Amino acid sequence: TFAVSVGGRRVDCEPGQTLLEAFLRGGVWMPNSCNQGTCGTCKLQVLSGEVDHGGAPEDTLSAEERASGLALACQARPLADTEVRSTADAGRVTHPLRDLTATVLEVADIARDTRRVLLGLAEPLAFEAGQYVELVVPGSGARRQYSLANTADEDKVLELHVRRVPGGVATDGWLFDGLAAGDRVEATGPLGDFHLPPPDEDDGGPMVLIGGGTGLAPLVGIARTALARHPSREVLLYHGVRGAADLYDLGRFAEIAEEHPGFRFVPVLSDEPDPAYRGGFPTDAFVEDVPSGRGWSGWLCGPPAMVEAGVKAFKRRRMSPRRIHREKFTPAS
Ligand SMILES: Cc1cc2nc3c(=O)[nH]c(=O)nc-3n(C[C@H](O)[C@H](O)[C@H](O)COP(=O)(O)OP(=O)(O)OC[C@H]3O[C@@H](n4cnc5c(N)ncnc54)[C@H](O)[C@@H]3O)c2cc1C
Ligand code: FES
Ligand SMILES: [Br-]
Ligand code: NA
């Protein structure tokens, strides 16, 4: 193994192991949001040593950047003892990344092309609401990310919301065709940075959360966590789907709203109109409801283009860049 360090903290990395996984398995945090080379948030400066850049794509890590000594922690494997620089906060404690002993407790068809998967764990998992877990497709080897809908106290049964992708390896080929209660599932977690700041740094200000499709999943955990901390706070949760057939858990959100007068749940249908529901695209509905985003925080999760367009729309209505949070469901193939 090689010694790899960030922020004064050392871990030992096996030669076939990536920098990111070595650090998180040691409880040493650095930014990460996909573990597959697409989000670019794990970019590092190599200060000393040497890495193999692995499968790092050019659009995430250019030849120019490699020549200047940058790398992606989730793609880089050490070829010598290596010292790296991440962000200022890298090196702080985080929940350790670990291998899970996970068993399917339930798989339920909950909406058009949508399944809930409940995974029971042998041991409690420490995580922040909004983090995700990485599943391995049995027999295939493909790795795919699924956000937790859980609050952190729901630490023994992981809740996933899975959207069927036609022709998809993990969804069409397994989670929608074959997965059954009692199956063991290869999984590691937690991963990801899409979560609330520590309670001490949470001013209780208003939040808008926008989920495209099953991008709703981490927002369920984040919204419930935020409301537990500040029960009267304003939390606007928009669910952007094609039609009413895509909606789910309406009763659960209604119970949240009855308890929390600042909470609202707003379906937004883009393709199949329904008189009961707002039409259009979900970021558009928030802008209509809240014409000025100044002083708001915003949480966007879903397909990458939806997130990126939503971020820009938030900023044009003067929401502060510092308070905009993103989780992109970027395809792995
Ligand atoms: C951090 C992160 C968190 C995620 N959390 C969730 C979650 O909570 N719930 C969830 O359902 N998914 C989530 N995803 C997306 C998920 O990991 C898979 O990519 C998705 O389920 C499709 O995988 P697949 O193997 O079925 O399709 P693949 O076999 O990888 O793709 C099949 C084909 O369809 C294309 N494709 C892939 N995705 C889409 C898509 N949405 N729409 C249209 N075409 C597509 C692919 O490019 C490919 O050509 C997350 C992704 C990331 C990076
Ligand atoms: S590019 Fe490395 S975690 Fe996303
Ligand atoms: Br476990
Ligand atoms: Na990193």
Report residue 238 as tokens.
Answer: 């928009």
161 is in an annotated binding site: yes
Are residues 226 and 325 both part of a single domain?
yes
Q: Kind and range of the H or E element at 284?
A: helix 282-289
What experiment produced this structure? X-ray
Task: Identify the residue whose tokens are 């609401």.
Answer: 129
Are residues 80 and 173 both part of a single domain?
no
- Size of the chain, expressed as the number of residues it contains: 333
CA pair distance 210, 213, nearest whole angstrom: 10
Are residues 12 and 113 both part of a single domain?
no
| Helices and strands in the chain, H and E counts | 6, 19
Which residues form the pocket of ligand 2, taking CB atoms under 6 Å from any ligand atom?
32-35, 37-42, 60, 72-74
Are residues 216 and 290 both part of a single domain?
yes
| Domain termination site, one of 191, 210, 229 | 191
CA pair distance 5, 28, nearest whole angstrom: 10
Per 3-state DSSP, the chain is made up of helix, strand and coil in percentages (nearest 5) of: 20, 35, 45
Are residues 200 and 321 both part of a single domain?
yes
**Helices 250-259 & 216-229 angle (0-180, nearest 10):** 20
CA pair distance 322, 22, nearest whole angstrom: 29
Please name the residues in contact with 250: beta carbons below 8 A apart, sequence gap of 6 or more.
265, 267
Q: From 278, 286, 199, 287, select the one nearest 236 (Cα to Cα).
A: 286
Q: Ligand 2, residues 18, 19, 34: which to mutate, most atoms within 8 A of Cβ? A: 34
Task: Identify the residue whose tokens are 């249908």.
Answer: 269
Q: Ligand 1, residues 34, 144, 241: which to mutate, most atoms within 8 A of Cβ? A: 144
Beta pairing partners, 11: 4
CA pair distance 128, 286, nearest whole angstrom: 26
CA distances from 55 to 38, 73, 167 (A): 10, 11, 24
Are residues 311 and 210 both part of a single domain?
yes
| Domain termination site, one of 73, 95, 117 | 95
Q: Ligand 1, residues 114, 145, 327: which to mutate, most atoms within 8 A of Cβ? A: 145
146 is in an annotated binding site: yes
Are residues 171 and 200 both part of a single domain?
no
Please name the residues in contact with 19: beta carbons below 8 A apart, sequence gap of 6 or more.
4, 13, 44, 51, 71, 73, 74, 76, 77, 78, 82, 84
**Which residue type occupies 60?**
T
Report which ligand 2 atom has the smallest distance to the Cα of 75: 2
Q: What Å resolution does this PDB entry report?
A: 1.7
Are residues 6 and 91 both part of a single domain?
yes
CA pair distance 162, 178, nearest whole angstrom: 14
Q: From 143, 246, 232, select the one nearest 188 (Cα to Cα).
A: 143
Task: Give me the domain span that covers residue 42.
Answer: 1-95
Are residues 280 and 319 both part of a single domain?
yes
What's the structural domain count of the chain? 3
Report which ligand 2 atom has the smallest distance to the Cα of 38: 1
Dihedral sign (CA 55, 59, 62, 66): negative
Mind spelling out the 3-state secondary structure of 100-157?
A: EEEEEEEEEEEECCEEEEEEEECCCCCCCCCCEEEEECCCCCCEEEEECCCCCCCCCE
| Domain termination site, one of 74, 95, 116 | 95
User: E-assigned strands of the chain?
Assistant: 2-6, 9-13, 43-48, 51-52, 70-72, 77-78, 82-85, 98-111, 114-121, 132-136, 143-147, 157-163, 184-191, 207-212, 235-241, 263-269, 278-279, 297-302, 324-328
Are 218 and 327 contacting, i.e. CB atoms less than 8 angstroms apart? yes
CA pair distance 141, 118, nearest whole angstrom: 21
CA pair distance 245, 114, nearest whole angstrom: 10
32 is in an annotated binding site: no
Are residues 104 and 145 both part of a single domain?
yes
Are residues 325 and 196 both part of a single domain?
yes
Ligand nearest to the CA of 75: 2
**Which value, to the nearest 10 degrees, does the dihedral of the CA atoms of residues 197, 201, 207, 213 take?**
0
145 is in an annotated binding site: yes
CA pair distance 280, 266, nearest whole angstrom: 12
Backbone interruptions in the chain following residues (C to N > 2.5 Å): none
Are residues 275 and 305 both part of a single domain?
yes
